[PDB]
Amino acid sequence: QEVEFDIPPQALGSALQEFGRQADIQVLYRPEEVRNKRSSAIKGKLEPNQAITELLRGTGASVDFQGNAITISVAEAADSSVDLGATMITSNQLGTITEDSGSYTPGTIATATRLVLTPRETPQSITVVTRQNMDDFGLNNIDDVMRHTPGITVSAYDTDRNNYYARGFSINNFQYDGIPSTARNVGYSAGNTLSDMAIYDRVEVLKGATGLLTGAGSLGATINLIRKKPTHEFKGHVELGAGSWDNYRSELDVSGPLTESGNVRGRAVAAYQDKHSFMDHYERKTSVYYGILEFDLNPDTMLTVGADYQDNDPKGSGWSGSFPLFDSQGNRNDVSRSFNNGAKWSSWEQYTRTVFANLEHNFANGWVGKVQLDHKINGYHAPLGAIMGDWPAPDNSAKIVAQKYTGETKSNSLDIYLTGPFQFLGREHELVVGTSASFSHWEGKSYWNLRNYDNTTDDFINWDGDIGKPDWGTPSQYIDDKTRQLGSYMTARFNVTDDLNLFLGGRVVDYRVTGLNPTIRESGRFIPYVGAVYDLNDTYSVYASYTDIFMPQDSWYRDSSNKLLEPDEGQNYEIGIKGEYLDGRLNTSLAYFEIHEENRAEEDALYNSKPTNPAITYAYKGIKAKTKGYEAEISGELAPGWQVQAGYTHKIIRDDSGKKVSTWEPQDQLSLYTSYKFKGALDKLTVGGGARWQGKSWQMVYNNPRSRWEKFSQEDYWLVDLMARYQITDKLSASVNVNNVFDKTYYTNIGFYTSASYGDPRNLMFSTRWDF
Template structure:
């Protein structure tokens, strides 16, 4: 498993010590970035580079990119960030963070025309978007499902039910999305070891800022965004921002369509020179004509060769969603460099569904079933923290300590109908709307988690940095319509990382992180199984060029999840009370995921942004109740090899108003086991192109071509008792932006 990465590691280390290294120490007093028509930017003055520039085989690169330590990506024009705190809550650069971390910046979102979180996951390094229906999806990484999403650092839970409501977040209100791959128990508490996505909201500006963006594209897709920000008093101590977006989309899929309305407002007030209060709210409403399930495979995974446009629900189907958020925080900065922050967030998410799905459950052929459900999901998050420097043994270090409270109340009820035979190749789309008894099913539960956490960045000698931390969690699950209540008391989640600066450009690191995930299955004594434990081991090398404007990393990781529930074999009423109505489980399952994570992101020149990543993952059963599973892939729907890249280049000289870009997504073969066979997706690659033209300082136009070669591929492979969805065919999107 190590062989593919050794040449990359060797090359990166060699660069760090080579006299030909492209990165020299960057001075802080460099001249300002040249204008769009300057010789340095156009490349015509490469023989005599300006002070602070780096000559790379005749190409002059100015090193003053101006993002060192800067977290906000809006208006930076960059594909990377200077600071992020999703992994440890300490404000660290990507190089200083001892985990695989990435960022999708505002500039990258705009260049690729990303509109919601699904687009981010599709293009972000090391993560995979897996659709199970037109408006149902899973986020995957390193062999596991992602079940934590953060908003401004406050975690929210997503599950099989709430994923569809919470994860379709419109990007109009966000500055960037930070991604931490691997276990994140220090910051999130309970969850899977896959990854965590942190959506960071836009904040008000003290100068006037107004933009209007309109887009139109294939299949009658239309979108408009309005974004306005300014100070609200003469002194600028009160600032405000509003963002609104409206989207009206049809689809390559027959019948399906979506209307989305998004509103976001935020106020920021300096109560005094040391204290800032922020308060805001957002509302997103989606009205969808949508299916409940996608397109099926045959009983044993056979490709049924359905048209990509096939829609197997009805024209009266709907899947409507409401997501309201309220958030606030108060930050106080002390004179000694410390700061205190109290933050809170409330989420009210609802889904109202009446739609159809396809099944072949009785072996008599495919039938259309109807279901009508209502979901209510309320989440509350509170967090209080202290962050600052301290002195020990004559050196300065950093510390963060905090407490958190997180609660989710979930309620779902509804019902379904018997199946009606359907012709998959000639669906009617207009069956009469049936009567559905919505009292057939109900689940109601509440999960409460409280935690105390701390992390310290110790600097014992100049090149060595040690991050030590941990979290103690209390978890309480209350099943309000039946049995299954349980508690987890004083669950300890450690965090450890070591970073050694090899020189002023490169650092080597190693880290160990954990996370726990409660489970509801019971054993033969009817006791709830103890939580699963996820462990993440990682070693790597990171490089930082041009004052942080370009970041590179390569990592080896190994992850294990232990205590996984598996159903006991050869059960009977004597060995499992309540059998066959209920089954008994054992917490003895174990899976392992190993791989390589590499990434390059940021500016190669002031006019050339790039993001490229390659991920290799091998995920296998180590211990399982079915011995024949051991050694097999446990997540075959996730690719072993995943490559993603995107780039944007502003042309030099007289063509400086033009910019061009491209993106590539390529992955190896994947499959899902179905019946006695499997549904397959062969290796594939899709290509996108972008071209933009800046007419003047106010007007800018852009066109995006997606899936240029019209590749037919599954974005969610059909699985046992389930369905999948094809990826979008070739399509165009035109956008025009006016800026004040």
Template sequence: MQDSRPAGRQFLVRRRFALRRTPCLVLMALACGAAAAQDSGVATLPTVQVLGEGDNTTTEGTGSYTPRATAASTGLPLTLRETPQSVTVVTRQRMEDENMLSLVDVMSSTPGISVQNYDSERYSFNARGFGISNYMYDGVPTNFEVGYAAGESSLDPIIYDRVEVVRGATGLMSGTGNPSASVNLVRKHANSREFAADMSVSVGNWDTYRATVDLSTPLSASGNVRGRIVSAYQDNHSYLDGYQNEKKIFYGVVDADITSRTTLSVGFNYQDNDPKRSNWGGFPLWYADGGRTDWVRSLNTGADWSSWGSTTQGAFASLEHRFENGWTVQAVGSHSKNEMDAKLLYLYGWPDRNTGLGMGTSPAWYLGDRKQNSVDLKASGPFTLFGRRHEAVVGASFNRQYANFDYREALNAAPMGNFLDWDGSYPEPDWSDTSVTASRYTTKQTGWYGALRLNLADPLKLIVGGRYATWKTDSVGFGGGDHTAFDKSEFIPYAGLLYDLNENYTAYVSYTGIFNPQSYQDRNGNWLDPLEGKSYEAGIKGEFLDGKLNASAAVFQVEQDNVAQADPGYMVPGSVNQAYTAAQGTRSRGFDLEVSGEVMPGWNLAAGWSHWTARDGDGNAIQTDQPRSLVRLFTTYQLPGDWNRLTVGGGVNWQSHVYTIASGPNGDERVGQGSYAITNLMARYRFNRNLSAQLNVNNLFDRKYYSQIGFYSQGAWAAGRSAMLTMRYQY
């Protein structure tokens, strides 16, 4: 949203950092210890699996925290050990154990991913120092502007089998984008040939109520046609005064085996978010005298009438055929539509410490939608050359995205009055009958991609490929001005070399090109050149217990030119938009450590430690508003013997400090949030094979911290301690 105050970044501090081998050794020692425990003769619990025919990537029903395979990085279904990039798969079991209720919950617990919220409805996700702009649904790319949020970060995970996150540059599969990560949301399918039901009711503090139903059934006597519906309803208040949200989710899919080797899937998804008293921006960080504020956590700057409603809906059809020679061809067509209707109030300025006067108001009404039509074609399979078996994938994707967001002006905005008495009862203004364009654009992307996985020797594999991407954009900015027309194309190379050190460990190196057209302008109104660069990664991956436990240690370096950085104090001529400069010679480097899976029977673990640092060509630290270091840990343990009905678990999410430069009454000032850790707990008791109860407690120690600080020189508190009890019935 051009007027919705996209986050600006200021960068001042210099830091130096040296990678050390110790973390890698610690991680691998943990994995080796787990393998030794398994080999000591402890019995393995049976695993229940619900799989589609020929599908080895589905995580639902496996009870695992790690996947058997993923195609997210190269388009080929490979194990994590065979994939020469840092990959995290948040499985169905982990989503259920942590009671993840939105994409924000998923990303907040994913190794290497940091989350920032701009206000009550808008969130951004970041990795390796850069914002994540690549999103995919079942492997089909899409993108969106955070400013014009239309329910993307509020997506409910209940309809997804897994969320695949590939960190680093992902040009082979997604084409354009930042070298941060790609997020692939993979929908559930109707895989069960028998009737199955999964229903739950939940209650939590802040008057939170939730009910879900997930039903699968054969639609033909033989089970070759199967159907599934997933639905959820949630009504909750919040730690923020007056805030309430009601959301409704529906998903339906039919999977039909036309022949024993051909499957047709057709599905539809819908989610409606109806929040009340949404806020736009945060609270003032200073009083008018320059002293820092310390508001109560429940302060909500939204008005009683403000709301940022959104609706997300989509439909898809997929046809897959599996040949006898091992090759598979797939065609996917999809349509999506995201709508928003946002009546908002922005408060700015600094209140007097005694009278509360001095704040200004800016009401606004934004509404519009974003639509996308996509087609993706892919073929993959084995071939023999020089007496060895290799694999190949070739594909093409085409998508067209159209967005049109309008703005209505407030005609008679009332004065703010005493902010110290603020309770949201600010009168709603009259709105103009005439809408003006806030943002309108059409973007067409095509991608032709291919990759070969060459078996050079028994321990040595080479993956080479690339994508030829085209990007055409035609857009106008606020008020119908600032016309932009891009027509860019680029070949994005990809290469990875893997060497099996022994039966458990594989060393790898990989390289990926970076290409990302930008819609930023400088202080003279000129458009910045596309972001270009290179991403390198090297590491070791370990696989243990027949793939039930995976571990990885990686170092990476990203080199880029034309990285957009806010130009403090300058706007684009003739607009209210922030001006940007293009930083040259930027470099981001760091490491990722991760372990996921079953450490020993009944003990699941997902843990990651990541660190990065980034500087521009002059050696200045950049992206300082994002945490350099992250630790993500969650584990569950099913008690043995007579206590085996009980599963207990918990985790910690820790991040290092962040800072930025904000403008206050005394001029520019450094503001930040120190490092902090959030502790979460869970416990589940299974009464019988059908009925269970689960309790989740988040932010156990009620830590008070900024969820964002410095965004337009304001701040916002994160949620305090919360708890939710869920009763679940499975048949």
């Protein structure tokens, strides 16, 4: 709607970048097309579509309107067949904004290489949950979003930490606006499983091996969370929502110019949720605040400062799973879904805050430069207490384990990178060159030396949490770990023919972990990136890529010889076809992929049976493992009011024993979410539904009292979601989400330290949203 403009005549490139910014729109244009042209002048309050054609007057260019993006083209009377994936310079370095897109398919993405590219242009598997997907299905945190992310599996560690798999691996890579955090372990990583969606536009998941931009990390995927940004027109909303088990949420979101001109601009959000739970004596309050100002130092240099804050504060936390699998004498426990072995006072509170600043500058080259500075904090306060062990006993008694960890991790990050186009053999290519540095320092207290506590409870079947709290005594331990990561990376994207694009890149990495453990050092490790995309028609392209990642091992993973295991490493091999329909409004992909892992830490049973090096007491073994699997997906418009996201993934991961692994992650899964917007008499109603199926999953767990291994299975099952919205008024709407319609009872954890967790029963959520 009607924006305030001011673009004086200049290089058409500069104008287009200046426009994207002022319009809150992404502008894509091909450098060689706009290079010897200038904009015509525009001034005043205008509608962006009128505005742009006025800007383009005299230039001979056409506009393609596409949601939150415009692409500019310069048609010739010539043309010999088209360059569908021609080098395109872009006005927003993170991609197209999904807020208000009306869509479940992303626009353009930078998660792969730092280069702004469409899913069809990216030679990796990239899934995105958009802002509208999030709104329609009430996905209010990262757990909700992973549960709705095709190809991800969410399993429980305990009431306050989940695990995300892809392709056989636990995901342990998180970025925010494309900047990796340190996630070496749960010390560094407080709150990562729990971020509220209130401050984010979309989460984008890059599946495979993602070393190129993550640096040191896990195989499986990177999760990239893009923050909400300020806008040039005023707007916002308030939201109220009320759900099953005394689940209350509120949320405020405000955005706009802060000066009469528009040269300073801000966005603020605050969200608060207080919920109980189907689980007995578990409650959890969450708080979030967020604020960001953008300042135009001048028409091609912008400074951003912002901060965010999230507190997650539960009662009734468990340490591991909701209940023990086996009783004192070895029989499987049968307990209600409400069972919670957490104590009343038990809490794993987790907090996160960031202070951050950017500087982004446009060189009249058409090259853009960007510096990103971060102060991150990840803190935890964890007085835990939870029935654990083979219980109850015959007289219905049980025993509690209690320990207390507190601590904070402080992180500092510098990320700097240049990106731009270049001519080579008569054609346009582009390149990114960046360097990065992060130092993060985990400091902590632990307590396990309980003074004079009676950790037995008189009654299991009716356990309440109603147990005393111990005297924690003095600290048992002080933690002091320091990680330093340093990167340099470079990727070229060569437009080789009119249907072939070749990716040649790499990261060199220096990684040092310091402190109470023997220093862990990796110098000059190379991480290769090779990719290709071949256009087939107006619609389909094939792609192949070879990609890599590593993580230096945790310091307790030493071998026979008391020598740290080589880094845990893998390569992703992928070949696929990707389809594009309705000018980018609908995307399909079908991929085959193979992960080759090497140096996967494993127990070393033959040494462990009777150790023989005085140096080590419990060695590990570095083995190879494989993932073989295929994946298909669709997202976007199936017909005018009709949006979907859906996926199908098949996997089996084996290790050098030949035995299946990550067998809790099902071998097959499907997701399908959809909504429909009626027209005519009922254009104000949006109706929606969803299904997630997964096939058999299992775990070998050891039944101590009987001295035998057992197989625990989860037979395949469906979960059904439904959804409706009614826009009663221009400014006000109502919603209902029913989740797990058929109240399926199933498991989200079997065998995590010999325990189990249930999935959510059927739950409802009612919301109003009010847009100013």
